[PDB]
Amino acid sequence: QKTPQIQVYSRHPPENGKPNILNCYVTQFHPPHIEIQMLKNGKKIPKVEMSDMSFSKDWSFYILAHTEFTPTETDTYACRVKHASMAEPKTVYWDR
Amino acid sequence: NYTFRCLQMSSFANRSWSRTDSVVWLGDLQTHRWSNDSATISFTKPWSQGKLSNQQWEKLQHMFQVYRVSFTRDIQELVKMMSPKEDYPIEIQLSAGCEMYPGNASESFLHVAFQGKYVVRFWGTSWQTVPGAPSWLDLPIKVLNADQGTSATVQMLLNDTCPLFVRGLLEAGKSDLEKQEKPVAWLSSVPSSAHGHRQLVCHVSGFYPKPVWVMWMRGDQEQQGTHRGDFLPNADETWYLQATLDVEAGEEAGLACRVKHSSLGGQDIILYW
Numbered sequence: 272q273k274t275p276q277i278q279v280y281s282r283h284p285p286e287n288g289k290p291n292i293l294n295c296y297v298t299q300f301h302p303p304h305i306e307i308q309m310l311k312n313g314k315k316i317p318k319v320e321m322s323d324m325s326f327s328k329d330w331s332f333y334i335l336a337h338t339e340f341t342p343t344e345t346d347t348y349a350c351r352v353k354h355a356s357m358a359e360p361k362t363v364y365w366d367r
Numbered sequence: 368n369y370t371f372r373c374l375q376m377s378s379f380a381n382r383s384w385s386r387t388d389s390v391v392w393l394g395d396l397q398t399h400r401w402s403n404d405s406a407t408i409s410f411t412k413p414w415s416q417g418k419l420s421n422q423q424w425e426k427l428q429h430m431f432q433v434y435r436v437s438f439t440r441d442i443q444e445l446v447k448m449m450s451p452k453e454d455y456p457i458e459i460q461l462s463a464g465c466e467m468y469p470g471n472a473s474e475s476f477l478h479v480a481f482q483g484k485y486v487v488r489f490w491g492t493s494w495q496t497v498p499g500a501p502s503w504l505d506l507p508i509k510v511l512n513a514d515q516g517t518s519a520t521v522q523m524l525l526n527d528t529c530p531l532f533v534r535g536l537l538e539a540g541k542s543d544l545e546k547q548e549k550p551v552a553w554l555s556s557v558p559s560s561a562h563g564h565r566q567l568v569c570h571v572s573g574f575y576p577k578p579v580w581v582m583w584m585r586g587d588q589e590q591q592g593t594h595r596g597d598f599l600p601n602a603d604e605t606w607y608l609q610a611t612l613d614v615e616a617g618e619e620a621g622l623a624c625r626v627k628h629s630s631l632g633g634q635d636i637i638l639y640w
C-alpha cells in the first residue's frame with residue numbers, strides 16, 4: 272500500500288485572461304483505484320481529461336489529469352485526491 | 368536506443384469483479400491502449416500497427432483476446448486453490464517487451480508483480496519465481512510451466528515478434544519519435560521552507576525529447592544550489608520540468624536561468640530575475 276504524490280503545474284507561462292492548461296500529475300500510488308478532482312475556488316471542475324493509467328519501473332502507478340483554464344488574479348486552483356492509503360483526501364494547490 | 372513495454376494492470380476485488388487494462392509505450396510515447404471495456408486493442412498513433420499486415424495484426428490481437436479471458440479465469444481459479452492465505456483484493460501487473468540496441472540487437476523481458484512487488488519472470492523457456500517470492504507460488508508456476516504451448520507462444524513473442532514489431536514501429540513512427548519541440552521557460556517564486564529566503568523557480572515546458580539542461584546562473588558561475596525536479600508529462604506529449612534555487616532576501620539580483628535543449632540548436636534560453 273502506497274501514498275500518492277501530487278504535483279500541479281501549468282502547460283504554458285500563466286498570463287491572466289489567456290487560455291492555458293493546468294496539469295495534475297499523481298504518482299507513486301498503490302493500489303490503482305483512485306479519485307482525482309481538480310478544484311477552482313473549492314468547487315470541482317466538471318470537464319477534466321484523464322490519461323490512461325500506467326506504472327513505472329518500480330511498479331507504482333501514475334496518471335495525468337488536465338483541464339482547460341484561463342487564470343485570473345483571484346481564482347485559486349487545486350487538485351484533490353482520494354485514495355485508500357489516506358484516511359483524509361490530500362489537496363495540493365497550484366503554486367503561482 | 369528504445370524500450371518497448373506493454374503494461375498490463377489486472378485488479379481482482381472479489382469472485383465476481385475483475386478488470387484488466389493495458390497500455391503500450393515505445394520509449395516515452397504511448398502506442399496502444401486496451402481497456403477492459405473493448406474487445407479490440409486501440410491505436411494511439413497513426414503508425415501503431417508498425418509494418419505488420421492486417422492479417423498479422425488480427426492474428427496477434429486474437430491471441431491476446433484469448434489470453435486476457437484465460438488469464439482472468441486462471442487467476443480467479445488460483446485464488447480458490449490457495450485461499451485463505453492471500454485473499455481479495457488482488458493486484459497483478461505484467462511488464463513485457465524488449466530493449467532495442469544498435470546493430471539490430473535486443474534483450475526481451477517479461478516481469479510480473481503481485482501486490483505491487485516483483486515475484487515472477489519468464490526466462491529462457493520457463494516461468495520462474497524470483498528469490499524471496501512467497502512459496503505458495505511454486506506449485507502454480509509448475510502447473511503453468513507444464514503448459515508447453517503457452518511456453519512456445521511466449522518464447523515466440525519474446526524472441527521473434529517483439530523485436531520484429533518494434534523495428535517496424537521505429538520506421539513507421541520515425542517523424543513522431545524524432546520530433547523536436549521547443550521549451551518555453553518562465554520564472555517565478557514561492558515560499559521557502561527556510562526563514563528569510565525566497566525559492567526562485569525556473570519552469571521549462573513543452574520540450575521534446577526528454578533530455579534537457581537547466582541551471583541557475585550568476586554570470587558564468589553555475590549555482591550549485593540549483594535543485595532540478597522530476598520530468599512531469601504535459602498532456603500533448605511534451606515534457607515539463609522546473610529547477611529551483613533558495614536564495615537569501617536581497618541576494619536575488621544578478622541571477623539568471625539558462626536552458627539548453629536539442630531543439631534550440633545552440634541558441635540557449637536565458638531569463639534574468
Ligand SMILES: *[C@@H]1O[C@H](CO)[C@@H](O[C@@H]2O[C@H](CO)[C@@H](O)[C@H](O)[C@H]2NC(C)=O)[C@H](O)[C@H]1NC(C)=O
Pocket residue numbers: 490491492522523526
Ligand atoms: C528464445 O531465446 C532464449 C534465449 O534467451 C532461448 O533459451 C535458451 O535456449 C538455449 C538453447 O536451446 C539453452 O541452452 C538456454 O539455456 C536457454 N537460455 C536460457 C537463458 O535459459 C530459447 O530457446 C529461445 N526460444 C525460441 C523459440 O527461439
Ligand SMILES: *[C@@H]1O[C@H](CO)[C@@H](O)[C@H](O)[C@H]1NC(C)=O
Pocket residue numbers: 380381383384
Ligand atoms: C465486488 O466488488 C465490487 C467492486 O469493489 C463491489 O462493488 C461489489 O459489491 C462486490 N460484490 C461482492 C458480491 O462482494
Ligand SMILES: *[C@@H]1O[C@H](CO)[C@@H](O)[C@H](O)[C@H]1NC(C)=O
Pocket residue numbers: 384385386387403404
Ligand atoms: C471486464 O471485462 C469482462 C469481460 O468482457 C467483463 O465481463 C467484466 O465484467 C468487466 N469488468 C468490469 C469491472 O467492467
